Coordinates of C-alpha atoms (C1' of nucleotides) and ligand atoms in Angstrom, one line a residue:
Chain A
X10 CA -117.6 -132.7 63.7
X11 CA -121.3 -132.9 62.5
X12 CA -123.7 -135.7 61.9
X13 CA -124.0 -137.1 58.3
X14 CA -127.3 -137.6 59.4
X15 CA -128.3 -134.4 60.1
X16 CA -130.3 -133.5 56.6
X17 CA -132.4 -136.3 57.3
X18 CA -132.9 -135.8 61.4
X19 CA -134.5 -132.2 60.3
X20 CA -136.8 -133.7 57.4
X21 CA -138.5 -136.4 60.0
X22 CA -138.7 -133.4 62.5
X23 CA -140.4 -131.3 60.1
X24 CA -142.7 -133.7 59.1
X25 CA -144.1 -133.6 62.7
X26 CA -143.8 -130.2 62.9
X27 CA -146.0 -129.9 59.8
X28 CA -148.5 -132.6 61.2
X29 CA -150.2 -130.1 63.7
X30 CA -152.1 -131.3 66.5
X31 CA -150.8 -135.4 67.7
X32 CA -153.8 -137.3 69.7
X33 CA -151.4 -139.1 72.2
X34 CA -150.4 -143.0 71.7
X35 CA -149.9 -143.2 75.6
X36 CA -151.5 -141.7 78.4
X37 CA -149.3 -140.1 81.2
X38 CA -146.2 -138.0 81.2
X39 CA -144.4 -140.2 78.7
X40 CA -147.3 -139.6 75.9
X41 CA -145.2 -136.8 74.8
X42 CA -142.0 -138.9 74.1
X43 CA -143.9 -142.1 72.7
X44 CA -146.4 -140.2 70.1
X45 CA -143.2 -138.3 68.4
X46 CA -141.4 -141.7 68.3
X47 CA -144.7 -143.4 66.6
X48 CA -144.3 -140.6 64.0
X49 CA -141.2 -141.2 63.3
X50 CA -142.3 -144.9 63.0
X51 CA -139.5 -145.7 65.6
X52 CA -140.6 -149.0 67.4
X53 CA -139.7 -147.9 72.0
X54 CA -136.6 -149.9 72.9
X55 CA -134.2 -149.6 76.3
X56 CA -130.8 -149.7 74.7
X57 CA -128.6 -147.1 75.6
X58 CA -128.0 -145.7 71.8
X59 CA -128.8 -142.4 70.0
X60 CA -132.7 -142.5 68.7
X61 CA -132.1 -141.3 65.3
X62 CA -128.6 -142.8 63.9
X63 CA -126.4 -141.0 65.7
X64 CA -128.5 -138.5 67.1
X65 CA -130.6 -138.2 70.3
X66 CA -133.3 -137.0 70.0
X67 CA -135.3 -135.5 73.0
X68 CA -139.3 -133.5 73.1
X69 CA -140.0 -131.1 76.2
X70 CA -143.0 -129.9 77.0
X71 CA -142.4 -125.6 77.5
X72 CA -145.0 -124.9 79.3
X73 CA -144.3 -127.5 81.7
X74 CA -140.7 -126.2 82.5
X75 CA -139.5 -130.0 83.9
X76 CA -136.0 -130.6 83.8
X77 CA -134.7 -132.7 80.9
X78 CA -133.6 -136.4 81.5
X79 CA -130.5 -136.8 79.8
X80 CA -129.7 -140.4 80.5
X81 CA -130.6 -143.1 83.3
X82 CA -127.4 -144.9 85.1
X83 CA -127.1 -147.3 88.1
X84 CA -124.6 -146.2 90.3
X85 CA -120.9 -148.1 89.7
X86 CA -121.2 -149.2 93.4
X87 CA -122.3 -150.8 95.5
X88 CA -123.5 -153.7 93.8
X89 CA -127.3 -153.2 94.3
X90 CA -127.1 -149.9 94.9
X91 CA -131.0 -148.6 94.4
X92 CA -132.5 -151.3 96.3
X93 CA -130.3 -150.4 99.5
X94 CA -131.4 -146.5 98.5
X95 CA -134.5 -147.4 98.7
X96 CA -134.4 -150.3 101.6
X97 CA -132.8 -148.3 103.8
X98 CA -133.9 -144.5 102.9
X99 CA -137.1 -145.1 101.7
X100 CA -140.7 -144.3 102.7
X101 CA -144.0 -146.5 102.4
X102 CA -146.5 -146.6 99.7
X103 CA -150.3 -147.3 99.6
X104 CA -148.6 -150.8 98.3
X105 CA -146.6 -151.6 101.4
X106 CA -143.0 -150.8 98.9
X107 CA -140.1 -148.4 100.5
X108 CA -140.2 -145.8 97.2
X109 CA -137.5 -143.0 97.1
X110 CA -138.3 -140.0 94.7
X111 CA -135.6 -137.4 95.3
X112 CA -134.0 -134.8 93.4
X113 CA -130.6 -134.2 94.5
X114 CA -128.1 -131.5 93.9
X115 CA -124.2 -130.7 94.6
X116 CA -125.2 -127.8 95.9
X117 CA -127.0 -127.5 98.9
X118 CA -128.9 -130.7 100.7
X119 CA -132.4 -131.3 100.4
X120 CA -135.1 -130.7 102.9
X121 CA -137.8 -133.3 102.9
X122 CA -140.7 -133.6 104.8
X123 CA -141.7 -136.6 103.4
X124 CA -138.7 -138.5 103.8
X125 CA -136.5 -139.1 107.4
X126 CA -133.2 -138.7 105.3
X127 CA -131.6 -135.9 103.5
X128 CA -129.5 -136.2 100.2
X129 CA -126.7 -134.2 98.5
X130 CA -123.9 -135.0 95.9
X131 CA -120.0 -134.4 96.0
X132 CA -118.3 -133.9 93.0
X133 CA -115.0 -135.6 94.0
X134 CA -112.6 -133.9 91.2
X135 CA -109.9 -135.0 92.5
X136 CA -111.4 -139.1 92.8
X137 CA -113.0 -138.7 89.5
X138 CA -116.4 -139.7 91.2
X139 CA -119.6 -138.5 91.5
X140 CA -121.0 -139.5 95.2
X141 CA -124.3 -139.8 96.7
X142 CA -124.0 -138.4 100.4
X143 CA -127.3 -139.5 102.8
X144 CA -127.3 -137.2 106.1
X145 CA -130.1 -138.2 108.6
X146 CA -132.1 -135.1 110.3
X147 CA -129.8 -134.5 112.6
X148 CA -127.5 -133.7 110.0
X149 CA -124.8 -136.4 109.9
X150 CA -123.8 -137.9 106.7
X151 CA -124.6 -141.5 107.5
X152 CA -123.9 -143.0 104.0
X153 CA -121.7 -142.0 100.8
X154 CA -121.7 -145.2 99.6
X155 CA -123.1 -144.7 96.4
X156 CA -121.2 -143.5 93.6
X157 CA -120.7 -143.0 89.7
X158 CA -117.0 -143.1 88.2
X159 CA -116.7 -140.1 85.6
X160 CA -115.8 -143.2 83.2
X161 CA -119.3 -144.5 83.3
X162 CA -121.1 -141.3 83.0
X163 CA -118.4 -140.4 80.3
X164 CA -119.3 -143.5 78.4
X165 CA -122.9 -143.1 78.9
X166 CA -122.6 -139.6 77.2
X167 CA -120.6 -140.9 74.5
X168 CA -122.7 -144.1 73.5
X169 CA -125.9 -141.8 73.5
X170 CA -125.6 -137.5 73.6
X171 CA -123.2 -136.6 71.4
X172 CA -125.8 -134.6 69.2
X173 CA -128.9 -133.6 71.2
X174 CA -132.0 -132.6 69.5
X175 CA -134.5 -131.3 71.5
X176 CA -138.2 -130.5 70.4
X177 CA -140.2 -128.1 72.2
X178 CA -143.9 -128.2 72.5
X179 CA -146.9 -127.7 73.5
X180 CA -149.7 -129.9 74.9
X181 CA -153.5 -129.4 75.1
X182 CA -157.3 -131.2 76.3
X183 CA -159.3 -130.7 74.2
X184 CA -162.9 -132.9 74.2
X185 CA -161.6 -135.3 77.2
X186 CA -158.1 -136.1 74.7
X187 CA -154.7 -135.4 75.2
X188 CA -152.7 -134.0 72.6
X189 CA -149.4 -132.7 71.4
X190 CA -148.3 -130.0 69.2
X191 CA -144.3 -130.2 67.9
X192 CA -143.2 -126.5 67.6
X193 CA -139.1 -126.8 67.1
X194 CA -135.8 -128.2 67.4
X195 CA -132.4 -127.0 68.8
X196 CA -129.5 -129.0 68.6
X197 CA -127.5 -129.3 71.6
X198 CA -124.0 -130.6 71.1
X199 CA -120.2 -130.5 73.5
X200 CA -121.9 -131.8 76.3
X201 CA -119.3 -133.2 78.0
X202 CA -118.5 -135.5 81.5
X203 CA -116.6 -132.4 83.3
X204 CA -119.5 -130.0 81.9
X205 CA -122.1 -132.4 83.2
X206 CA -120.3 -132.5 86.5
X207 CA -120.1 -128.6 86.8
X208 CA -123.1 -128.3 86.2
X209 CA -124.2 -130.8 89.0
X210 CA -122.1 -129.0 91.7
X211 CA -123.5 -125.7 90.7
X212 CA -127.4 -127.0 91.0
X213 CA -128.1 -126.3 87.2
X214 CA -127.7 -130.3 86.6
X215 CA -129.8 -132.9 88.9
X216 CA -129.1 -136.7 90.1
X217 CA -133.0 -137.7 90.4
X218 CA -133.7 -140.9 92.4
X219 CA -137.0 -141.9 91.0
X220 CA -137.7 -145.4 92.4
X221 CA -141.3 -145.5 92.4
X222 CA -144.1 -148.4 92.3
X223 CA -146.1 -149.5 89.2
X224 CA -150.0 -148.3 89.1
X225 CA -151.6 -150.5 86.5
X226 CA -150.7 -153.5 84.2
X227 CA -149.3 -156.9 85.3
X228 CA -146.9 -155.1 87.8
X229 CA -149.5 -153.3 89.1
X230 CA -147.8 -152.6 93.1
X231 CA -144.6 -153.6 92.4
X232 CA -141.3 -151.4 92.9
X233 CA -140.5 -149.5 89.8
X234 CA -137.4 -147.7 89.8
X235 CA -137.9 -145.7 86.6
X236 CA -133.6 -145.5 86.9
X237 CA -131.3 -142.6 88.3
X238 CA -131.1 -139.6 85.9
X239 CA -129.1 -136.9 84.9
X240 CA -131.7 -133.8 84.0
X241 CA -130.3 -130.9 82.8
X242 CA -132.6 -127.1 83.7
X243 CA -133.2 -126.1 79.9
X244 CA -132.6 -122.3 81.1
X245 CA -128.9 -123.3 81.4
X246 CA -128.0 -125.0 78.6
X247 CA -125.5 -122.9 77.5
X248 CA -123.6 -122.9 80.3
X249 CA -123.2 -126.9 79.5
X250 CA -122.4 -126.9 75.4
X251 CA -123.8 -125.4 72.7
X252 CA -127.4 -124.9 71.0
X253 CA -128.3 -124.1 68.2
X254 CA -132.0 -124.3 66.2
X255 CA -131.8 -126.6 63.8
X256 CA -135.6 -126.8 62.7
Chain B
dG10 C1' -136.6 -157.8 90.2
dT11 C1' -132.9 -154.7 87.9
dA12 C1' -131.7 -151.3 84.7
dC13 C1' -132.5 -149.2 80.7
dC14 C1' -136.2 -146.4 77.8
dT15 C1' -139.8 -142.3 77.7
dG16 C1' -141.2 -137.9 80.6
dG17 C1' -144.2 -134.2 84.3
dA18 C1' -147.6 -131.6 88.2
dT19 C1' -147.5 -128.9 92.1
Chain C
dC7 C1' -136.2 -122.2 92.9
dA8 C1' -137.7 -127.3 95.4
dT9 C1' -140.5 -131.5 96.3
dC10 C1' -142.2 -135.5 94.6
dC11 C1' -143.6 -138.2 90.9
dA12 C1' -145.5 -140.7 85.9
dG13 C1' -146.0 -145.3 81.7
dG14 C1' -143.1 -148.5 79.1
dT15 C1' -139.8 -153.2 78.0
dA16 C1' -135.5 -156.8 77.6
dC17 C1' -133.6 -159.9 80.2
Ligands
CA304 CA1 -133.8 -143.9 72.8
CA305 CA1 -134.5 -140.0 73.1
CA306 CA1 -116.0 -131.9 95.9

DNA sequence: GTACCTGGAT
DNA sequence: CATCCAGGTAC
C-alpha cells in the first residue's frame, strides 16, 4: 500500500514550498535537484535508495519540459559495456575523448548528424530483455550487443521508485543569480518493469546514453559518463502508473 | 576510470 | 516531437 512516511514527506515539501524564492547551492542543470536536497538538509550521496525513507523524491523544472530521469543503470552485458559504446560509436571532443550523447527510443531509430551511427531499442518480450541495437548509415544493424535483463531494471525500480514524488517548478535570473521556486508535488506510484518497458517501445519512455567529458574541477577533460537513464515524458505519466497531488 | 547520484537548452 | 548535453561523489 502507502508510505508510513508520507505525513512527513508532505511537511518537508511544504516547508520549501513555503520558502519562496531558493538562490541555487550549484550552478548548472543539477542546481535544481541539489538546492531542494540542502533544504531538506539531505547530505548528495550515489546509492541507489529512495531519497526520503522510502520515497523518491524528484523536482522538474515546467518550463523546461526535459524528460524525467528515473534511474541510471549500466547495461547487464557486456562487461564494459559504455566504454565500448563510446570507443566504438563515439565522436570527438574539444578534449580529444570519443563522447556519446544519444537519446534512444523503441520506436523509430535516430537520425544524427553529429554522430556516424544510428541507435534504437528492442523490447524483446519474449527474452525478457531490453537491447541496444547500433545500425551504421547505411542502415545495417552492426551491434545489439548491449542489453538490460528486465530483472535488473525490475530491481532497480524496486530498490528506488516505488513512491515517486515529483516537485514542479519554476526557475528565474534575477541580478546575475540563479534561482528556484518549489510550486508542488504529485505522487507517482505502480510504476512497474512491463510499464516501463511499454512505455520504451511506444517512445513515451527514453534509454539516454549520456557519456560526456568533465568541464571544470580535478577531472577537468576526462570522460564522464553521467550513467544510462530511463526518463520518462511527464505528459505521459498516466499511461505508466498513477499520480496523484499530494502537496 | 566505472557506475551511481542530481538534472536541462535548443 | 528530436538532438545533444550539464555538475556531483564512492570506490
Ligand atoms: Ca537519491
Ligand atoms: Ca531523487
Ligand atoms: Ca520486440
Amino acid at each position: 500500500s502507502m508510505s508510513e512516511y508520507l505525513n512527513l514527506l508532505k511537511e518537508a515539501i511544504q516547508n520549501v514550498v513555503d520558502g519562496g524564492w531558493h538562490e541555487t547551492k550549484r550552478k548548472g542543470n543539477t542546481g535544481i535537484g541539489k538546492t531542494f536536497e540542502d533544504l531538506l538538509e539531505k547530505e548528495e550521496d550515489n546509492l541507489d535508495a529512495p531519497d526520503f525513507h522510502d520515497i523518491e523524491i524528484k523536482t522538474h523544472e515546467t518550463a523546461a519540459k526535459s524528460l524525467l530521469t528515473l534511474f541510471t543503470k549500466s547495461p547487464t552485458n557486456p562487461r564494459g559495456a559504455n566504454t565500448m559504446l563510446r570507443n566504438r560509436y563515439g565522436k570527438k571532443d574539444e578534449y580529444g575523448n570519443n563522447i556519446l550523447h544519444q537519446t534512444v527510443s523503441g520506436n523509430r531509430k535516430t537520425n544524427s548528424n553529429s554522430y556516424n551511427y544510428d541507435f534504437k531499442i528492442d523490447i524483446d518480450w519474449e527474452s525478457q530483455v531490453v537491447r541496444l541495437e547500433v545500425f551504421d548509415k547505411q542502415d545495417i544493424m552492426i551491434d545489439n550487443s548491449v542489453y538490460w535483463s528486465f530483472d535488473s531494471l525490475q530491481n532497480q525500480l524496486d530498490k528506488k521508485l516505488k513512491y515517486i514524488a515529483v516537485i514542479s517548478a519554476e526557475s528565474k535570473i534575477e541580478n546575475e543569480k540563479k534561482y528556484y521556486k518549489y510550486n508542488s508535488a504529485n505522487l507517482f506510484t505502480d510504476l512497474t518493469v512491463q510499464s516501463l518497458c511499454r512505455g520504451i517501445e511506444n517512445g513515451d519512455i527514453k534509454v539516454d546514453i549520456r557519456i560526456g567529458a568533465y568541464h571544470s574541477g580535478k577531472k577537468k577533460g576526462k570522460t564522464h559518463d553521467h550513467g544510462t537513464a530511463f526518463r520518462i515524458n511527464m505528459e505521459k505519466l498516466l499511461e505508466y502508473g498513477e499520480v496523484k497531488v499530494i502537496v
